[PDB]
Amino acid sequence: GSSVETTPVNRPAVGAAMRLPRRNIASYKQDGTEIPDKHQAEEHLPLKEKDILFLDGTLKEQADKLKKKINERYSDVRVITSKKEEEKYQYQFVRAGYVFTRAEGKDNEKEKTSDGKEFVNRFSYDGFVYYSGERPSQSLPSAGTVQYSGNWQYMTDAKRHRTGKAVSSTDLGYTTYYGNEIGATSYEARDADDREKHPAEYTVDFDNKTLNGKLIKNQYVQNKSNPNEPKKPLTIYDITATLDGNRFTGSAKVSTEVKTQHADKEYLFFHTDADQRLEGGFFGDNGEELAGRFISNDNSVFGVFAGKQKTKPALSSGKHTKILDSLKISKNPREFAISSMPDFGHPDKLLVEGREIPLVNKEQTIELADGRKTTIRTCCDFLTYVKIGRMQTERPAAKPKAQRNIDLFLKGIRTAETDIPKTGEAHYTGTWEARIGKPIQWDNQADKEAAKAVFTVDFGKKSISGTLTEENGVEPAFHIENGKIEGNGFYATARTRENGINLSTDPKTFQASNLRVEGGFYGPQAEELGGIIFNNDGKSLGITEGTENKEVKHQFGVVFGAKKDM
Amino acid sequence: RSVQWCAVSQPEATKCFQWQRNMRRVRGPPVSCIKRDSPIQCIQAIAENRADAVTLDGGFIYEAGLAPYKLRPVAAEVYGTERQPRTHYYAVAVVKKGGSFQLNELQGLKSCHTGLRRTAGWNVPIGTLRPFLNWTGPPEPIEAAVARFFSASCVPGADKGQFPNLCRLCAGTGENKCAFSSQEPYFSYSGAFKCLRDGAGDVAFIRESTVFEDLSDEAERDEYELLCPDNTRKPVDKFKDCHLARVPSHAVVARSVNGKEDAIWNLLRQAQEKFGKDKSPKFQLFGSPSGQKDLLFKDSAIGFSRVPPRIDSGLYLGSGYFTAIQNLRKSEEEVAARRARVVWCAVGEQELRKCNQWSGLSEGSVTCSSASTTEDCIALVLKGEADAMSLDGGYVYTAGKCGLVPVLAENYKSQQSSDPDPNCVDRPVEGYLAVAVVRRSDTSLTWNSVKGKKSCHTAVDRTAGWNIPMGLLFNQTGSCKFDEYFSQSCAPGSDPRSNLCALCIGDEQGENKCVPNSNERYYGYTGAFRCLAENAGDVAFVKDVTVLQNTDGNNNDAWAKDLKLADFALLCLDGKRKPVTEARSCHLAMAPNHAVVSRMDKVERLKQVLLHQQAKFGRNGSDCPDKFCLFQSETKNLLFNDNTECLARLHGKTTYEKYLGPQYVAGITNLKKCSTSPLLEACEFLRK
Ligand SMILES: [Fe+3]
């Protein structure tokens, strides 16, 4: 499938880009000269919503893909990146930059008739403006307002006569031909302050889940001899957005100062708003950085931007509350360790290679870009704010005959810390999945018709406990005790009976001595439950994933999830 | 008796009196004259049957269309020449050639306006200058913000006592200073230009053609420039690129009912013939004596174009201009909320109720508008009062012929089901099968003798119910009289007195018979099938999945419970009959899926809302059935067909021709050559 709940405008992404438009400046039709009076073939080329590229991978990997696209079009042209401009921001999980080329020695894209007259002529310039993100935030600041600082890039459409009388692009504030034959780009801004052309400011209110921001252009300053000549900031866009999960959607509006003061220079490029056409997200484990994008109403501007951060009084009681859980435990298995799985906070959706794929009842196969094919089977219809299951990634290149390797995952959207009950006792029941390890292997499918996985917690007492049956009773099963739930999640200890039943051949017993259990509550008023059992250190979900407080290793994994009834 | 024309000024009465004498001289259609003090007084007089017609600017067509007046345009002024006629003109801002400012940097200057609430005079310029006005919003009048924006201006008709700044630039030689009359020299299109030519102001918001009619030759017109919305200055000739708005021509309005529409057009047609342009020596119908501007008609107008009866004030002005006038009395906050929300259009009260449940759960993204018939709902989105609705393929032709585009399609079960589909949104549509359903007892019923029986239809102009069956019967007879294909029928949307409605049963009280919405119990897919199930008709034209879903206990309604699928057969195009299950080989034609339509300016936002709402309330949604379901729920076949799994993307078929298909569109327009379709005749006028 694909992303079935969003348009290319409001689609969540770990990276998005737009390519430089190049209008057809030819003066000939496909047969004879241009009947329009000394006009060109394409005098106005707006941007396209269907031309928005969505990226995946690390920050470096996303940039290389854009560099590959340019290098695929031209043989050996030098590619210019924004790595020099991004140095002063020291981003750790985001980028708001550009990749482009000037196509030195490369002629224009041309298509001519048999007689010789050319009816297609596009400048051989090429480039991108993009934002990239790593580690979508699983926990956010608990409350208050947080100041963010950063930069932004943009790319406009191509219009032949902005002022109506064929002026130079330098007079309008851009490098020659930019805005006329190709789109105007932030990386060819000519009338900006070279010290910092496009600074950006943000103010995120985590109390009201709202975002405010300003996209600013530092205007040109005549004298560059004084290092501290005052800047001339000019607000171009005013940003408003509302938070949802670790992402936000909103609008971008051109400032009135641009409209009334710079009516003949800046208003020629920034003249239409992006109403409900702005989206973004927070990146880093604790929402340290943000990145986003927007495209205006008339597709005249595509902008990208990035930002970075500059007890019981309130919800701010530790400054970090877990927002969502998305982790995996990596036929023979793979490296038995946990790792955060990128996600936007949608339990029934899995983020794989930039696109969100929906999760169905069980046994669906999705194909990756490199050639490997992974088949997943997630849990059951009754769980809605938490999902569990497993997936195995296979590369089907070994041609036999008829008929990271196997991972167990946990996904869910947490409950607000000011939404967990503080009074009473509740009962949950669900299912659980488990895998043995490298020696004699034992898999346990999550069923909800063969696994009981009962739970009980007194919210007034915070003493969660439960058992996950396999055959009958809890004799061939685990027992979870010593609850002590903590804020958004909980941590417990795992014990089994005298042994575990796997199948006088060799009764395959399994023993467990007070293993570590961690998990959290998901959704509304603690509708559901979920967690994991693992042993490397005090390093799991639940508490804000800092992975500290130990220290031995093993190879075993079991993930559970349950819903309540009464 | 005769046509009573209304004059809003003392000199307009004199020319109208001249008009009355000349018509009697040539023994033409008579015209009498009634004198009033303002166009609004003329609008009120017409509503009182003390007058019949008046020429009106687009800004007062809107006023005439409001309650309780509700006057509709009947004849539009025609500008240009006979060989190049046009029924629209451009609102422009004319300035001196000395540059130095644009359309945004004009605060503190002096402006000349044709008049308060006029199209190019007031409504268009103030609307585009609103972001710079610092207006507090309604109910506080916007004239206060304007009177504070410009240093001084001449706005004829403005309240001189409350906003004297809006009248300081007029020269009326007494209390005729800020007059909405030709007694003010700066009054009309021509008058406001004089206010600029004299030098009183630095900008005149007038027609694009005032300079050509008031300046002798191409020597003085080069002293004046135009202000484009892109904040550039361009020569006068390029008004098509440097206009503030394209707006319809001024029009003659009359009463909606008993408005003497036939007589008014007959009078204007003959006056144009005799006293039009370059005609009888004295008394040209357009243009009149010293210092007078546009007496009863625009000067240098050439004639009239008749407006179809269906067109009201909202449709005539167009959605862009209609909402712009409305936005002038909505708060800046209200304007943004309207643009960001999806206004669904419901057909009937029952669909309105379901929408009202949806609106409260849409988190402010969906609101509701209601119309009595589907064509009315199309007109609502055409006027901007509505945004979207799901239409049968036949109605998609109408909406597409009116400029609306499909956005998402109602996806049904595929030709290979295999599951509840996760990628339903990206699954291409496959259409549905239209069938003819008969009771298996009637074994003499064949397709070769279907005519003359009793027929049940979903509604007129619908695909499976009307277009596919009647098109097949029309392709072999050539008869346009569809009321004679069958002896009696229930075809909702027809003439209630016709025999095409003789089989409908109305609501539970028996009223609202043949009405084309859920109130009529024989309406739609299931209503037509019920019309067959109760022996009202002999053959029902529905889709094949309807019979399956309303038999064998799949529907627990009394009329459908105890109905067995074995008691029904399908009329194939052989004369042979087959069971309902074999519809794949015994269907009439393939029918394109029902689709959601909207204006092009709303497609992207509509996609955002619908793709999110159906994730919550669609089939297999988070909040369905616990909170609400768009599709089959406690509600059946309202706003969406019950067989809908999801709203799916169109894969590029974003126009009614591309979506409906080349052959199906060609078939519909062949049938439409027989009919009138007041909505289609309205859109044919508008797209011209
Ligand atoms: Fe006008």
Short mmCIF file of C-alpha atoms and ligand atoms in Angstrom, two decimals, chain B residues 56-59 79 89 114 118-121 189 207 247-250 321, ligand 1:
data_model
loop_
_atom_site.label_atom_id
_atom_site.label_comp_id
_atom_site.label_asym_id
_atom_site.label_seq_id
_atom_site.Cartn_x
_atom_site.Cartn_y
_atom_site.Cartn_z
CA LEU B 56 -28.42 47.23 -11.41
CA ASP B 57 -24.70 47.01 -10.78
CA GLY B 58 -23.41 43.69 -9.50
CA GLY B 59 -23.06 45.19 -6.03
CA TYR B 79 -20.38 45.56 -23.86
CA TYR B 89 -15.91 43.90 -17.38
CA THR B 114 -17.98 55.31 -8.36
CA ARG B 118 -20.60 49.17 -6.23
CA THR B 119 -18.52 46.46 -7.87
CA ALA B 120 -15.53 48.28 -9.37
CA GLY B 121 -16.32 51.38 -7.34
CA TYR B 189 -17.50 55.24 -13.76
CA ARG B 207 -14.06 50.37 -15.30
CA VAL B 247 -16.87 40.78 -12.82
CA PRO B 248 -20.19 40.22 -14.65
CA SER B 249 -21.98 43.01 -16.46
CA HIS B 250 -24.75 45.05 -14.90
CA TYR B 321 -17.24 37.70 -6.28
FE FE C 1 -20.06 48.46 -11.78
#
